[PDB]
Curated annotation (Swiss-Prot), chain A:
Gene: rpoC
UniProt protein name: DNA-directed RNA polymerase subunit beta'
Consequence recorded when altering A20 to T/V: Resistant to antibiotics salinamide A and B
UniProt source species: Escherichia coli (strain K12)
Similarity annotation: Belongs to the RNA polymerase beta' chain family.
Job description of the protein: DNA-dependent RNA polymerase (RNAP) catalyzes the transcription of DNA into RNA using the four ribonucleoside triphosphates as substrates. Resistance to the antibiotics salinamide A, salinamide B, rifampicin, streptolydigin, CBR703, myxopyronin, and lipiarmycin can result from mutations in this protein.
Documented effect of changing F4C: Resistant to antibiotics salinamide A and B
Curated annotation (Swiss-Prot), chain B:
Function per UniProt: DNA-dependent RNA polymerase (RNAP) catalyzes the transcription of DNA into RNA using the four ribonucleoside triphosphates as substrates. Resistance to the antibiotics salinamide A, salinamide B, rifampicin, streptolydigin, CBR703, myxopyronin, and lipiarmycin can result from mutations in this protein.
Family membership: Belongs to the RNA polymerase beta chain family.
Organism name: Escherichia coli (strain K12)
HAMAP family: RNApol_bact_RpoB (MF_01321)
Protein name (Swiss-Prot/TrEMBL): DNA-directed RNA polymerase subunit beta
Reaction(s) this enzyme catalyzes, per UniProt: RNA(n) + a ribonucleoside 5'-triphosphate = RNA(n+1) + diphosphate
E.C. designation(s): 2.7.7.6
UniProt keyword list: Acetylation, Antibiotic resistance, DNA-directed RNA polymerase, Nucleotidyltransferase, Transcription, Transferase
Keyword Zinc (UniProt): no
One MF term in the entry's GO annotations: ribonucleoside binding
Residues that bear N6-acetyllysine: K1021, K1199
Curated annotation (Swiss-Prot), chain D:
Disulfide bonding pattern of the chain: none
Highest classification ranks of the organism: Bacteria, Pseudomonadati, Pseudomonadota, Gammaproteobacteria, Enterobacterales
Protein name listed in UniProt: RNA polymerase sigma-54 factor
Biological role: Sigma factors are initiation factors that promote the attachment of RNA polymerase to specific initiation sites and are then released. This sigma factor is responsible for the expression of enzymes involved in arginine catabolism. The open complex (sigma-54 and core RNA polymerase) serves as the receptor for the receipt of the melting signal from the remotely bound activator protein GlnG(NtrC).
Domain of life: Bacteria
Similarity comment text for this entry: Belongs to the sigma-54 factor family.
Gene behind this protein: rpoN
Length: 50, 1340, 51, 102, 455
DNA sequence: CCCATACTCTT
DNA sequence: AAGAGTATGGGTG
């Protein structure tokens, strides 16, 4: 029920850390998965020229 | 009451909640672990005692002799920590171990004691830990990181229906020992149990049961109960219990004892069961078809025929019932099974299991474990015995035994270290009970299942690993019978143990060079927890669930400070108050609540214990006697939080900083920052570089002193006293008389570290913070280390900052910096670099270090002394000579041309070739230190003698201080004795001290006392001469170097780096940026008084990042600077002390019921003036991370200093003088300089060296390499259509050997054209493919 | 060593236009097989392309 | 795996200077032969007759070889590819300014 | 080769040695008529050695060295992410390249970049050698080399001459969509950082908090013309993915343009009639009128005709001072209605797209540069800051929270009485809290967005 | 984690 | 005697 101007207590901050770390881990780990998709897309359509 | 160090400058505190438990020593986790490893233990439970007892005694096959361990001992180290760092050797102690070889006679009861020989042997060196929790390995400080691993015991888990497409879950159990073989039990989609040994081919689960001498009847009895059907001439009447009928539907009309409880087609209800229990139904009438599918348990044989009728665990039929009916077998035992529970999994697995004996199971186990070889009965038996039931190949440790007993609901805690039959039976029964929906699986990420392992335990494990190998060697060498002459010393070789210890302490994954950016870096490094390492996880096969924040992390692991990237969630920081059990589990302290009254009792609870209580938050109001003001308080109960009544509270938190780590507790207004930016700020705060002068934060949290003192970078008084001598390099303290030991001169000497290189090529320098003659007490700070200011951590500088856009120069996190910042050297840093020159020995003669290089001019040799080494204090640049060296080129045939050369020019120029050490290109600095290491037996040059003389002078002075004190005391005694009788007074004063020994008195004690005093004086002189000789011998000892190495010379260069655009700056709230422009002073915005700002930051970076702590910090820093300005104005115009102390008391009294009380009435005028002098640059302020200052308090402090309450003022443009249209937030922030300098980043290349194989440019700035043009860049060029750019990048720039030369020539000639060829890498590929036996070739 | 994995008689000279023993040493003897050591007199880069 | 790198010897430096010098084809061949004849101390190891024979063309006289050799001897370092000590010293002295005292 | 005279050994050489030793032993055993029980074992070991040499670890257990690390075979060199194909053939390291940290250059034009001159001296070295030898300053290659090493004063003028119209390629990793490599004209600067134009950062996904970039130099005439005609930043204005413009103002430029084109109810100089935009600028600079004052201004605007000619019309428009000032930047051919409003990011993007579709490419580049300059200048002039008092909390937050807590308490008591179940109570509590959050958000936003002024 | 292949129970 | 299904192994990140 608090905002950042008022300030959070220990329990609320501890609760928010779960979502913070989940988002950070997802961002760190999907980089290695998008590159595989773009590599496969380039491999399948390398030679198509007008 | 305040200490001397704190009373000089008191930091105002806005905290409101009293402290009940002080912050503990921050390095206990390392010190306690190593002390436990090293200390003598009467019991064999920890350390070297456990390792020695776990192997010894060692007995030979014959049994006629054995070796017995008695005790061990650690000798004194040869050198000190500082001496080891200077010389570059390991700081270690020798291990002396007492062994006893005992011999036994033959043909006698037991073993007759023929001969016992006891000898103390040398086992090797053991590295020691310093006072700060580090190890000096090869002269460099190192840290061993603790590991968070999986606890030994038994664990039950399941898959979430992922392995089977039907969405059916499969359960499993696993037994994890400390050392041994794994044992797994698992289910299959067919409800059959299976057993896996060390992750190998699956086996039926009854093989292990049959390997333990178990009959099928016994197995059925263990895993199933019995139901008795009796032939009573009424269609096999059965003995039945009503509860058995629950969960079933009536097959027919259920009537017993003349009462129809249930009818056919009607399910049995609970009321029917209760009626059956009330009537005590025992006899039933069922049809002969009731045993159509029932399973018989035991074996029944007809006594007449004498043959088996039905085998054990077989389904009966009507014909079998008839067969047993004619034989008159009135007892049939079936197995009570159902569908809701009591599954037949054991019986079905038994039916599927092929073996039905005790010997074939061992054969199958041996074949599975060791295929490809024929089986053997003895081999299989030995393998099975040594797999799980041998103390020398399997150990379920004390913690493993405790966890095993806890998981099975046992009562005892202690036990054996090996498995038994009953343990496996209990594990199987528990797994079956889980399968029948009568239990729960375990949580792997729960902190009660993860354990902490520190350096002492790892060292013990490695020592045992070496010890077992030494034991094997001893047993192999003990077969020969020579007990009449052999000794234990010749039996054991210390090479394997010492090699293993060195390997662990030097090249382990968890042993790293200590991070030495600042004291916070070291504190953070020593308190780090890792899930990686030997026996841990990998960053590519970890998973998301192990990287998450768990509820059990509360108060034990910081939920914020973790690296971002591949290692997120795998590297953690210990919380402030966290500890470990004796078993290695994290625990946190709480205050006990009794009858609604909060007491001062502190209990450390672990994760398992914590979940069974209702624990209140630390943000809970309390009365004066300890009563909750409200009636409903917020509490966590079972992994979740809610409101509870006042009488349901069990415990409360001890502090509001219990949840966070040391690094996160240093961020002010942390509760106003988003968690992502808090993580970024915590990570960036420990990579700041120290500057020329330290500056305290001026807005802190109260943890600065603890970090500064516990890091060990400062000089702390060991005993109280008075400063007798103070200097820029040494401090001498005269100890108080009540803290002195008998018969000593009470003085303490502190030698400060001056301009020393760190592990990150930075500067380590100490400066005194005490004056000549002032009192000190134990624990006071005598000298500040790097990034320390009067005993407080000082990582950055205070900067006057405005939040506004300025002509696009702070666009996208750019920073605009004033020129006055550069002119004041506020962010200038010192960097120290080391270079080495090695002179070896060749076959044609040895290399010589000399100043007589024949091919160089006189100017280049001007900076070298007579020994060929550069002077101290010389400014050198790229290509200058540091150490001159020549290499013997060797003898020749001396042809007439060579004879002419030798005759005309000389002989020195014809025998040696220059191999000097020179400054690398792009490097400069000042020579500040030179070290010379010489092999023992080689003559030293003059430079080494000068260094040794300088090193001897310091020790001589240190000894002279104590010698002078003692001799002054003794001569005072002599004068006191001599005056009493034959007093000369002035005449005695005229004579020198030495003449007093010649003067005598009568034959009374007036002469015996003088003789005793003279003897004591001579003894003192002899003792100090012996001390000086010992120090000289230690100093002059030679250096042991690598084979074929004669001398080593090390030169240290120092440079100063100034701030410039392209350098990275940051705050403590995750607000980083790069300098874009240095602005002249008259262009900066200024206020009504003409004062400009130092930094301009973009306000657009705040709202989206949600790091609001920086705005509040800016406002509070403005207020603190205003208070300091008032104090400075009062000091400038000399006023009375009364007004100063009145104003300072008013400033310290501000706040709403704060817990800090400062009273200046107990301060003297001198102390008040000193404090006021220290406060004239601003009053420092502390705000704890969840008990900080409110906005109203900040506004009150602003009002006290006569500043606008909004925190915003009017500014004027420096270039036009026009006022900006809106008020701007102006204040003070704490900025840091990060170790990302554009001097180390910029790199360019035209042409250079190439690889020998691929013929392509090298990589790295150190090799002057090129940039990589990878596949994505090629794709971008293909998408553009730039074919010529791509071809030029692929051939004439990388590996077209002729094309490179032709392109260079054409470019120089002014013709921009290329002639591409074939890359060399394609030729290499063709050759490599041909080497595989494949014919690949080019066509046409 | 002769007939080894780096033999100059099989793979080529270790110096430009020189044989192993040293009878022939300059460009005037290009394309000459020394009877003593058996090494050809040519460029040393042939060791990248001789199997 | 670190495969090692390439180093520049005296002959590599001399050939680099040859490639960027306005020579003709025959002059470049003669320069190649001369640089091949230079040893590690910077002295020529064969008489010019051997170089003329190694050129392999009968249309070329020894004076052209002498001119090419003189041009090469002014490369960096000065005095390289000298026939003997006297020639090397004379070449080095030729590059000094006239104001030298002796 | 290592210090101390140790040559060590390679994996391939070790495998070859093993094969040769086994082959020689087998030859000797075969020619000695050895018993078959031993020659069979020798043949098996020779087969294993050959298999290990060709592909270690494929069959059986891999042969390791002294470091408990399996040796590398021919197959290991051929294949993998560290093999020839992916490490040396599909990508490679190149010459004439550099890298360093990037800062922001606000004064630059769209086709220019800021290159440190210390980097440029190293990158363009052979060009400088040729130019020095071309004008008689140096007579030999060694003389030019020594002059460049000593860094005389004339070599800087030579360097300024040789980079006058020579493009360079800037690249930031990772490269995703071909806009991660672009071409720019260098401007020599002091320092060690590369200056980047603010309008291209979105294409690079770059920010100035520690990012680094690499720079490459085209050599031949074809490469230089490809850089100028295909990869130049003034050619890549539209996105190849969807056709929308990519050089769009953001942050400071948007804030400044939005601030200048706003109106206030009662501002200084309100309600006067001006002859044109220049009079409005004179009034603003003199301090006689506010930037937000509502006035009437005579505006002349041009419109394209049917055959493609511009026709001008002049009329009095009701506008503000700031909009009239901004109108002096718009090129001929656009309606005045395109600026007579408060401009956000979408409006500025639409204005740029309209200019591109109607007028062409070069006017769009000029317009974008002028927009960036004007936005930066007026954002600086505004003095916009951030303070703690700007975050206004609605006054009704506490009562909404209290009412939500009361509803939660009453439904909890109802659950205690047994009227409901667990899941229904949980969902109802969630719904209550969501409704309370929506109420608080609406109250806060309604309080924040309006202010009261005196007429 | 996903796909291809040898061995096992069913119509 | 075919045919559908399960345990094992290879290549990928
Ligand atoms: Mg960035
Ligand atoms: Zn030869």
């Amino acid at each position: 029920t608090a905002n950042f101007r008022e300030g959070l207590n220990v329990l609320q901050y501890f609760i928010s850390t779960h979502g913070a770390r989940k988002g950070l881990a997802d961002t760190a780990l999907k980089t290695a998965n998008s590159g595989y998709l773009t590599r496969r897309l380039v491999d399948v359509a390398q030679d198509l020229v007008v | 009451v305040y200490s001397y160090t704190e009373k000089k400058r008191i930091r105002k505190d806005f905290g409101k909640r009293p402290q009940v438990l002080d912050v503990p020593y921050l390095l206990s986790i390392q010190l306690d672990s190593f002390q436990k490893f090293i200390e003598q233990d009467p019991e064999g439970q920890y350390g070297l005692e456990a390792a020695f007892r776990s192997v010894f005694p060692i007995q030979s096959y014959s049994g006629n002799s054995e070796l017995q361990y008695v005790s061990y001992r650690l000798g004194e180290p040869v050198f000190d920590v500082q001496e080891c760092q200077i010389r570059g050797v390991t700081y270690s102690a020798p291990l002396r171990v007492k062994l006893r070889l005992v011999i036994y006679e033959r043909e006698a009861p037991e073993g007759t004691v023929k001969d016992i020989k006891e000898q103390e042997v040398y086992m090797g060196e053991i590295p020691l830990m310093t006072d700060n929790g580090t190890f000096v390995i090869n002269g460099t400080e190192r840290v061993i990181v603790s590991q968070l691993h999986r606890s030994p015991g038994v664990f039950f888990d399941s898959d979430k229906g992922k392995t089977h497409s039907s969405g059916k879950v499969l359960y499993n159990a696993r037994i994890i020992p400390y050392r041994g073989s794994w044992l797994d039990f698992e289910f299959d989609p067919k409800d059959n149990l299976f057993v896996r040994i060390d992750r190998r081919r699956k086996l039926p689960a009854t093989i292990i049961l049959r390997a333990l001498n178990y009959t099928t009847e016994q197995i059925l009895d263990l895993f199933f109960e019995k139901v008795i059907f009796e032939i009573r001439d009424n269609k096999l009447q059965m003995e039945l219990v009503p509860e058995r009928l629950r969960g079933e539907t009536a097959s027919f009309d259920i009537e017993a004892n003349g009462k129809v409880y249930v009818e056919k087609g009607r399910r049995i209800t609970a009321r029917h069961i209760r009626q059956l229990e009330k009537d005590d139904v025992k006899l039933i009438e069922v049809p002969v078809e009731y045993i159509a599918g029932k399973v018989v348990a035991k074996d029944y044989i007809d006594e007449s025929t004498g043959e088996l009728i039905c085998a054990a665990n077989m389904e009966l039929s009507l014909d079998l019932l008839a067969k047993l009916s004619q034989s008159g077998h009135k007892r049939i035992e079936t197995l009570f099974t159902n569908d809701l529970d009591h599954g037949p999994y054991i019986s079905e697995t038994l039916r599927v299991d092929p073996t039905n004996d005790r010997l074939s199971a061992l054969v199958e186990i041996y074949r599975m474990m060791r295929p490809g070889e024929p089986p053997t009965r003895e081999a299989a038996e030995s393998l099975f015995e040594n797999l799980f039931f041998s103390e020398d190949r399997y150990d379920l440790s004390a913690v493993g035994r405790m966890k095993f007993n806890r998981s099975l609901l046992r009562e005892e805690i202690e036990g054996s270290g090996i498995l038994s039959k009953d343990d496996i039976i209990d594990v199987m029964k528990k797994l079956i009970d889980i399968r029948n929906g009568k239990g729960e699986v375990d949580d792997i990420d729960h902190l009660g299942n993860r354990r902490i392992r520190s350096v002492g335990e790892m060292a013990e494990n490695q020592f045992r690993v070496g010890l077992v190998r030494v034991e094997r060697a001893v047993k192999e060498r003990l077969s020969l019978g020579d007990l009449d002459t052999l000794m234990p010393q010749d039996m054991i070789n210390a090479k394997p143990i010492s090699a293993a210890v060195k390997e662990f302490f030097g090249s382990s994954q968890l042993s790293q060079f200590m991070d030495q950016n600042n004291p916070l870096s070291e504190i953070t490094h020593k308190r780090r927890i890792s899930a990686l390492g030997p026996g841990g996880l990998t960053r590519e096969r970890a998973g998301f669930e192990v990287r998450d924040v768990h509820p059990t992390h509360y108060g034990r692991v910081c939920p914020i400070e973790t690296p971002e990237g591949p290692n997120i969630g795998l590297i953690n920081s210990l919380s402030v108050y966290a500890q470990t059990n004796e078993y290695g589990f994290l625990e946190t302290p709480y205050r006990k609540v009794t009858d609604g009254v909060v007491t001062d009792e502190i209990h450390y609870l672990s994760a398992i214990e914590e979940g069974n209580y209702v624990i209140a938050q630390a943000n809970s109001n309390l009365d004066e006697e300890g009563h909750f003001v409200e009636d409903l308080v917020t509490c966590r109960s079972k992994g979740e939080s809610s409101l509870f009544s006042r009488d349901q509270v069990d415990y409360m938190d001890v502090s509001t900083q219990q949840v966070v780590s040391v690094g996160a507790s240093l961020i002010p207004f942390l509760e106003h920052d988003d968690a992502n930016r808090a993580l970024m700020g915590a990570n960036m705060q420990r990579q700041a570089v120290p500057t020329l002068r330290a500056d305290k934060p001026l807005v802190g949290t109260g943890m600065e002193r603890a970090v500064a003192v516990d890091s060990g970078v400062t000089a702390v008084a060991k005993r109280g006293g008075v400063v007798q001598y103070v200097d820029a390099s040494r401090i001498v303290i005269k100890v108080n008389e009540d803290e002195m030991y008998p018969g000593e001169a009470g003085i303490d000497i502190y030698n400060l570290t001056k301009y020393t290189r760190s592990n990150q090529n930075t500067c380590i320098n100490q400066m005194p913070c005490v004056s000549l003659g002032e009192p000190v007490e134990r624990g006071d700070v005598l000298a500040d280390g790097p990034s320390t200011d009067l005993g407080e951590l000082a990582l950055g500088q205070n900067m006057r900052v405005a939040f506004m856009p300025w002509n696009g120069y702070n666009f996208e996190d750019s920073i605009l910096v004033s020129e006055r910042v550069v002119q004041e050297d506020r962010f200038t840093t010192i960097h120290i670099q080391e270079l080495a020159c090695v002179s070896r020995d060749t076959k044609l003669g040895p290399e010589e270090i000399t100043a007589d290089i024949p091919n160089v001019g006189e100017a280049a040799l001007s900076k070298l002394d007579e020994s060929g080494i550069v002077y101290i204090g010389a400014e050198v640049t790229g290509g200058d000579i540091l150490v001159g060296k020549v290499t013997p080129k060797g003898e020749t045939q001396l042809t007439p041309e060579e004879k002419l050369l030798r005759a005309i020019f000389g002989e020195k120029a014809s025998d040696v070739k220059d191999s000097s050490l020179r400054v690398p290109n792009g490097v400069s600095g000042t020579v500040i230190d030179v070290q010379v290491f010489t092999r023992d037996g080689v003559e030293k040059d003059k430079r080494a003698l000068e260094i040794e003389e300088m090193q001897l002078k310091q020790a001589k002075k240190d000894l002279s201080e104590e010698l002078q004190i003692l001799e002054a005391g003794l001569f005072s005694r002599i004068r006191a004795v001599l005056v009493a009788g034959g007093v000369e007074a002035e005449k005695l004063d005229k004579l020198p001290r030495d003449r007093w020994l010649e003067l005598g008195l009568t034959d009374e004690e007036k002469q015996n006392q003088l003789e005793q005093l003279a003897e004591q004086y001579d003894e003192l002189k002899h003792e100090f001469e012996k001390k000086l000789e010992a120090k000289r011998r230690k100093i002059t000892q030679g250096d042991d170097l690598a084979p074929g190495v004669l001398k080593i010379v090390k030169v240290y260069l120092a440079v100063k780096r100034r701030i410039q655009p392209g350098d990275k700056m940051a705050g403590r709230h995750g607000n980083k940026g790069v300098i874009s422009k240095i602005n002249p002073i008259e262009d900066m915005p200024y206020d009504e008084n003409g004062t400009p700002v130092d930094i301009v930051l973009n306000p657009l970076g705040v709202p989206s990042r949600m790091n609001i702590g920086q705005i509040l910090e800016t406002h509070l820093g403005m207020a603190a600077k205003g208070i300091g300005d008032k104090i400075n104005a009062m000091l400038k115009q000399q006023q009375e002390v009364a007004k100063l102390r009145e104003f300072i008391q008013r400033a310290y009294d501000l706040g709403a019921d704060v817990r800090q009380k400062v009273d200046l009435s107990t301060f003297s005028d001198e102390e008040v003036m000193r404090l006021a002098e220290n406060l004239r640059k601003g009053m420092p302020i502390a705000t704890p991370v969840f008990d900080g200052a409110k906005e109203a308090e900040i506004k009150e402090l602003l009002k006290l200093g006569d500043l606008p309450t909004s925190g915003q003022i009017r500014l004027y443009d420096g270039r036009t003088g026009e006022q900006f249209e809106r008020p701007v937030t102006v204040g003070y922030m704490y900025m840091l300089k990060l170790n990302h300098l554009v001097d180390d980043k910029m790199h360019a290349r035209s042409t250079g060296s190439y690889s020998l194989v691929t013929q392509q440019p090298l990589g790295g700035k150190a090799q002057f390499g090129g940039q990589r043009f990878g596949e994505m860049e090629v794709w971008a060029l293909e998408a553009y259509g730039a074919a010529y750019t791509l071809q030029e990048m692929l051939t004439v720039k990388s590996d077209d050997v002729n094309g490179r030369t032709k392109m260079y020539k054409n470019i120089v000639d002014g013709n921009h054209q290329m002639e591409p060829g074939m890359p060399e890498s394609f030729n290499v590929l063709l050759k490599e493919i041909r080497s595989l036996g494949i014919n690949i070739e080019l066509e046409d | 060593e002769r007939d080894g994995l780096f033999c100059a008689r099989i793979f080529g000279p270790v110096k430009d236009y020189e044989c192993l023993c040293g009878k022939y040493k300059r460009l005037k003897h290009r394309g000459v097989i020394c009877e003593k050591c058996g090494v050809e007199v040519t460029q040393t880069k042939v060791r990248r392309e001789r199997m | 795996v670190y495969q090692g790198e390439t180093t520049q010897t005296l002959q590599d430096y001399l050939m680099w200077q040859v490639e960027l010098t306005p020579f003709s084809d025959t002059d470049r061949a003669i320069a190649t032969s001369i640089v091949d004849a230079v040893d590690e101390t910077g002295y020529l190891t064969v008489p010019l007759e051997d170089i003329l024979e190694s050129i392999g063309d009968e249309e070329i006289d020894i004076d052209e070889v002498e001119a090419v050799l003189k041009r090469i001897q002014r490369f960096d370092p000065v005095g390289v590819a000298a026939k003997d000590l006297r020639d090397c010293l004379l070449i080095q002295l030729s590059q000094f300014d006239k104001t030298t005292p002796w | 080769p290592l210090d101390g005279g140790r040559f060590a050994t390679s994996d391939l050489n070790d495998l070859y040695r093993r094969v040769i030793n086994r082959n020689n032993r087998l030859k000797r055993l075969l020619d000695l008529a050895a018993p078959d029980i031993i020659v069979r074992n020798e043949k098996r070991m020779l087969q294993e050695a050959v298999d290990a040499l060709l592909d270690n670890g494929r069959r059986g257990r891999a042969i390791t060295g002294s470091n408990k690390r399996p040796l590398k075979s021919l197959a290991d060199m051929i294949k993998g992410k560290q093999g020839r194909f992916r490490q040396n053939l599909l990508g490679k390291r190149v010459d004439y390249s550099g890298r360093s940290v990037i800062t922001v250059g606000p004064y630059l034009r769209l086709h220019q970049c800021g290159l440190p001159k210390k980097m440029a001296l190293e990158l363009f070295k052979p060009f400088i050698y040729g130019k020095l030898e071309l004008r008689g300053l140096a007579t030999t290659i060694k003389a030019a080399k020594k002059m460049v090493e000593r860094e005389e004063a004339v070599v800087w003028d030579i360097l300024d001459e040789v980079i006058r119209e020579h493009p360079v390629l800037l690249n930031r990793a990772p490269t995703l969509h071909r806009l991660g490599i672009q071409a720019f004209e260098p401007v020599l600067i002091e320092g060690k950082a590369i200056q980047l134009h603010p309008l291209v950062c979105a294409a690079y996904n770059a920010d100035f908090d520690g990012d680094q970039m690499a720079v490459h130099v085209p050599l031949t005439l074809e490469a230089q013309l490809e850089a100028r005609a295909l990869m130049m930043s003034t050619n890549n204005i539209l996105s190849p993915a969807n056709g929308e413009p990519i050089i769009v103002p953001s942050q400071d430029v948007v804030l400044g343009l939005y601030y200048m084109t706003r109106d206030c109810v009662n501002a200084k100089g309100e309600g006067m009639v001006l002859t044109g935009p220049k009079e409005a600028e004179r009034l603003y600079r003199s301090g006689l009128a506010s930037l937000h004052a509502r006035v009437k201004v005579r505006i002349t605007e041009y419109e394209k005709d049917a055959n493609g000619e511009l026709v001008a019309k002049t009329s009095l428009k009701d506008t503000t001072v700031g909009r009239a000032i901004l109108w002096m930047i718009v090129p001929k051919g656009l309606p005045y209605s395109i600026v007579n409003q408060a401009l956000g990011k979408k409006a500025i993007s639409k204005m740029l797209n309209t200019c591109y579709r109607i007028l062409g490419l070069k006017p769009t580049v000029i317009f974008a540069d002028q927009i960036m300059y004007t936005g930066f200048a007026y954002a600086a002039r505004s003095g916009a800051s951030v303070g703690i008092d700007d975050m206004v909390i609605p006054e009704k937050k506490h009562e909404i929270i209290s009412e939500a807590e009361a509803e939660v308490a009453e439904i909890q008591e109802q659950f205690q009485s047994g009227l409901v179940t667990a899941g229904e109570r949980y969902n109802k509590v969630i719904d209550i809290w969501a409704a309370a959050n929506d109420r608080v958000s609406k109250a806060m936003m309604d309080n924040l967005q309006t202010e009261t002024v005196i007429n």
